[PDB]
Design a protein around this ligand. Structure first.
Ligand code: GGO
Lengths: 726, 726
């Protein structure tokens, strides 16, 4: 028949998925950015109007990669000169455009190289970080206010996170939090003074005669961590002559005793804020709730109003302890915690009551609390059809927990089993985002009746196109390892025939709380490998997996590099026994953590895999950051878990590579998983006399995402798998 | 028949070449180190005696990788704790053993981490460098004498060279020169204060958590060079309370005007020393001759006694201006300079006479002045049979230049056409070292009659072995490019048949003044490729080549990356037209400069080569050191030669790689040709969409010589060529 999904189709993106990215600016309207201009839509009827003309900035004399509209509708922050840094951080230039007088504000503008800018939740206030310091701008055109004075590049961070807090705990560059009505501005301060530095070369443009040495504060497992401090300033009592006074919120005592982290900050009310602290041994976490003392200016976190969240089987939280969701009066909150059975469900807390009440339960987990009203609590779980690789929106009645209602399950069971949601400001309207198993589907509904208002995007255009091509099929199912059931998924070739014996590629990640077997629709490298190369691309979620309860997830506690890789081999070993697998041609590949596992699996001497590809893998945990590695491995000291830190390296298995064909790929500018980790993998192989393929990607980081590097690395890998299979 | 020379034979060294390394300690005896003990031989009769028993140091409690016997016979310098640095430099610990009292001297011993140690030419004096400073030890057991006090790691070097002087001009770490009778000690001082640094990561042992950044003062083309100063101290007028006074010898004026180098120091007499200076534009070089002023302590280099050596066609000297050889009275000297016809021959100088007299002439060149007596001058040239890839020892009568006599030519024309020689102290005896075309042959002779005394080693043992194996044959011959003849050599497979069509590998180097076509016997990778894989491994010496006169050598002046690569293609293009070459399977590979050419050739779009391998190549000249690059390319400024610096990069040709199969190999710790150069080659290929193979060698430098890396890199390459050919 016609043609297949080729590699060029994947790299050149000839089949484009359509999205529908809207931005709720109220409880009735959302902004729908189009390529040229920005519209404004009326959720109820759908009528729309141009918010601002595409031509409006024709002669701005600068490319604008991003806009940001004040919660006022009164102003537009314009971002340009974007210069990416790490996964989330980056700097840019900003100009504020007045929608009132339609004038570009030119006085007291924001500095260039600003690290972070953000409006207050309600007016048109501004808080930005520049040179690691925090500034506040009560008016778009008024002089700025210095909040902090201790900023020092690479040493002291104010309002922005350092490398590890950004990547590991906050997953953001920003470390500042406005209060509900913009009155207060809370922020964190990080001190990297004694954090060791990671140094690597950056070659830059050909014209750069001498390579530069990039050095960033990065604590590797067991190293000295950055320290943290919290402050809350009053953006209403700030002069222009006085130095704004930032009130510090310290403690708790149970955390000050030793190395700790600040893992969450969520405002309860106009004057109440909650902080969540975590010990370096991510076993024990403490949440404090502080009130602003009217006639003292300070903040008081009452003991008795704090809640301890710990774990005897593993660490706290999937990645970081859950986020609390406070009721209007802030006198109580809902948050996802682990079950007495080990399943993450919603617990209802009274700020001054020690015990909470689980409102949900069962052998499934609540992914996330999406919205809260005085009436209902909207959450997303994988309860439906009892399959953890699904996602549906549910709403539970706060008056009767017995009354839980799924709002996505039946909308279109055939095409959608994986939703994500986006509510308007008061949760009066919401947009459901279906991403599989069929083509992505975007629709709008209203919370009063959960009535379907209309389809925002059905990817019909993409569909029309995809019928002229032999697409691969996806099978989501499970197998049974001694009692427990583990899910897997296989990307099957067009006209798949269970009679024939296909070569198999095991796409692996297997990180703690990961999930490679789901119902999401994807047009990636696997699509091609199956559509054109007729290769089955499988994925198995074994011990360590997430969203299935701690008994499975914490299985690899203080024991990384064990069961999760062991089960990957087990899965393949079974896949081959299913009759449509040529057990003579079974390969495995993964990126990041998946690269670590690929290597561990190829070095297991299992004999199951013929060849494999590791892309930017981890070779030994003492090389990765503290926050991540220690959450699962504890500390690398002989009193804690050093022995296992040593038993789970890749180099220690080098000898067993004699039996396989291996391809090691790593970007030289990887700040996350340092090139060092692969430099130690190759050295071990060379010392053992093992031949293998290699490929470095100069100036590329953990993503190898630049246009040319991306197309280059998949082409190289495609050849590799073809060679190993044909 | 039996078997072939396999890859394992090459890597595991199953067929060992025998040598005969002796050390003349007089004009009648030499020391012959054996594995266990050290013997002493009587050149005349051959009788020998044990100089020191192998057991003598059984319980020294340290492995000794090297000995050094005083020109006294009285002492033995013992080297241990060897820690290699660059190509020549390294540090070690030293203990001196007294052969008189057979006692290990324990007082005032030499410091650990000593950079360089050396005896005086006659007694048992010692001069060593430690922490970049010079110390002198008049007695093995007496307190040391600080000569210099300005030493500063990576900034100021005293008595030892910095990176570039070591690698480029002196080809040694040592920068100190004793006078004939040990009275005076001359030394150079280098200042790297403003030399930019090259920085790269060194990952070290797996246990090293954070990679270290190695940084060394390295001037790249056009960068700021180190500056130099010369001093001569009197090791006889040194107290133990006073700070030794070092008299500086400066100028010349014609050199102080701008950037210059110190390219040679050779003592004439007990009180006379000669220095050779070279301008940064290695066009013009000045030799000063200085005498020690008896009643003034200072040194005077008389103008009038200095000689200018320049060149209008190219640079001065093959690599650095030749070394002068003074007559006993130091009132005249012989040195190899370029002919008026462009051929390097011996010129006779009177220290105060401007013009010299050429004693040799012809269309061949004098390789080197080996020995000088009041009677004859012994030199080595490639005059015999008129083939520049040969080497023979000649002696010319100083009384009649008409009387030149070859001393090696006829000894064994069949087996030996490439000799090197080693004279006893007074040139009363000499050892000839034949290294091809047959098996290496070592013999001893006496200068009075040039009588053959006896064979020292004939590699009979290796010969007996090699007859049980199908060895490859070597053909040395030339072709004719418009008038001129250029030599080539081919390593032919056993039972070669000019009827059959063999795949061909072009082994290339082609650096300025290089010579890949010679008559030397070698057991290397080529041996295997031909003996077992039946692949012809050729080598062609075209424009740029050396030992054939400047018309050929200076052809690539200020024009690297042009003719020398062009002719490599030309040679292959002819080789294919010789009927025993499968022009469908022609490959090319090279290391260093040969890697640069391989890349330039593969990016020429010639279509002649199918595949190729570049090992640690140079991609663009602005990346290599100043001294080397500028000697051939001038300065990278728009007023000099920047345009061509830019036209000869490898990246600029990236596009044309679409047509070939390429393998890029580079060591990550290469301090010479920085990994940067290949990081820029791969980046260019990725940006152009070209697929290729790669392989980095973690912690290996320009040599990739460590045991495991060495065996690893040839195995990988062997597979590559086989894939490309079979
Ligand atoms: N660097 C890790 C970051 N991360 C957690 C992100 C996150 C933070 C906060 C949060 C989250 C998720 O959900 C809710 O709140 C990961 O998921 C994996 C990342 C990883 C693992 C490896 F082993 C690698 F080698 C390389 C690598 F980047």
């Amino acid at each position: 028949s016609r043609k297949t999904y080729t590699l060029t189709d994947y790299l050149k993106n000839t089949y484009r998925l359509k999205l529908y990215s809207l931005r709720w600016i109220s409880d009735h309207e959302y902004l729908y950015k189009q390529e040229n201009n920005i519209l404004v839509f009326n959720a109820e009827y759908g009528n729309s109007s141009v918010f601002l003309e595409n031509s409006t900035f024709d002669e701005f004399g600068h490319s604008i990669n991003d806009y940001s509209i004040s919660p006022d509708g009164q102003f537009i922050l314009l971002e340009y000169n974007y210069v990416k840094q790490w996964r989330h951080s980056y700097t840019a230039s900003y100009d504020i455009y007045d929608l009132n007088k339609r004038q570009l504000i030119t006085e007291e503008r924001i500095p260039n190289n600003t690290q972070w800018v953000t409006w207050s939740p309600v007016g048109h206030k501004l808080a930005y970080v520049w040179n690691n310091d925090i500034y506040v701008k009560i008016e778009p055109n008024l002089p700025s206010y210095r909040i902090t004075w201790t900023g020092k590049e690479d040493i002291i961070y104010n309002g922005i996170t350092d490398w590890v807090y950004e990547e590991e705990v906050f997953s953001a560059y920003s470390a500042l939090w406005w209060s509900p009505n913009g009155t207060f501005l809370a922020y964190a301060q990080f001190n990297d003074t004694e954090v060791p530095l990671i140094e690597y070369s950056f070659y830059s443009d050909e014209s750069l005669q001498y390579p530069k040495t990039v050095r960033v504060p990065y604590p590797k497992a067991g190293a000295v961590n950055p320290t943290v401090k919290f402050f809350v300033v009053n953006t209403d009592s700030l002069s222009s002559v006085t130095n704004a006074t930032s009130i510090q919120i310290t403690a708790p005592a149970s955390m000050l005793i030793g190395d700790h982290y600040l893992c969450d900050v969520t405002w309860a009310t106009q004057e109440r804020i909650s902080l969540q602290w975590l010990r370096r041994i991510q076993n024990y976490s403490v949440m404090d709730i502080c009130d602003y003392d009217e006639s003292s200016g300070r903040w008081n976190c009452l003991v008795a109003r704090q809640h301890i969240e710990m774990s005897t089987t593993g660490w706290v939280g999937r990645f970081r302890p859950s986020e609390p969701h406070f009721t209007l009066d802030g006198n109580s909150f809902y948050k996802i915690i682990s079950n007495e059975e080990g399943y993450r469900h919603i617990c209802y807390f009274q700020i001054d009551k020690k015990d909470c009440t689980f409102i949900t339960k069962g052998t499934w987990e609540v992914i996330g609390i999406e919205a809260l009203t005085s009436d209902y609590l909207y959450y997303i779980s994988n309860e439906y059809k009892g399959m953890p690789g699904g996602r549906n929106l549910y709403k539970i009645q706060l008056s009767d927990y017995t009354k839980v209602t799924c709002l996505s399950c039946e909308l279109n069971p055939e095409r959608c089993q994986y939703y994500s949601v986006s509510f308007s400001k008061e949760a009066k309207y919401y947009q459901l985002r279906c991403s599989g198993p069929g083509l992505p589907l975007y629709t709008l509904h209203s919370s009063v009746n959960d009535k379907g208002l209309r389809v925002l995007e059905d990817n019909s255009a993409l569909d029309k196109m995809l019928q002229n091509v032999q697409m691969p099929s996806k099978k989501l199912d499970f197998i049974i390892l001694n009692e427990t059931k583990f899910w897997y998924q296989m990307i099957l070739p067009p006209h798949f025939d269970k009679s024939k014996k296909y070569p198999l590629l095991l796409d692996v990640y297997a990180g703690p709380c990961s999930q490679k077997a789901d119902t999401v629709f994807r047009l990636n490298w696997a699509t091609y490998l199956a559509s054109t190369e007729n290769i089955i691309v499988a994925s198995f979620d074994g011990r360590g997996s997430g969203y299935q309860g701690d008994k499975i997830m914490h299985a690899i506690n203080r024991r990384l590099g064990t069961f999760e890789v062991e089960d990957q081999i087990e899965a393949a070993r079974q896949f081959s026994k299913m009759g449509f697998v040529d057990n003579k041609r079974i390969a495995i590949w993964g990126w990041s953590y998946g690269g670590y596992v690929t290597s561990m699996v190829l070095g297991s001497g299992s004999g199951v895999f013929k060849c494999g590809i590791a892309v930017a893998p981890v070779s030994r945990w003492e090389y990765y950051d503290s926050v991540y590695t220690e959450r699962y491995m504890g500390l690398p000291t002989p009193e804690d878990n050093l022995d296992h830190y040593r038993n789970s390296t890749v180099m220690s298995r080098a000898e067993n590579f004699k039996q396989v064909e291996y391809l090691l790929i790593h970007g030289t500018a990887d700040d996350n998983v340092h090139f060092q980790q692969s430099a130690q993998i190759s050295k071990a192989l060379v010392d053992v006399g093992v031949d293998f393929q290699a490929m470095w990607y100069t100036d590329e980081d953990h993503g190898i995402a630049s246009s040319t590097a991306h197309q280059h690395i998949y082409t190289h890998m495609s050849h590799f798998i073809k060679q190993c299979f044909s």
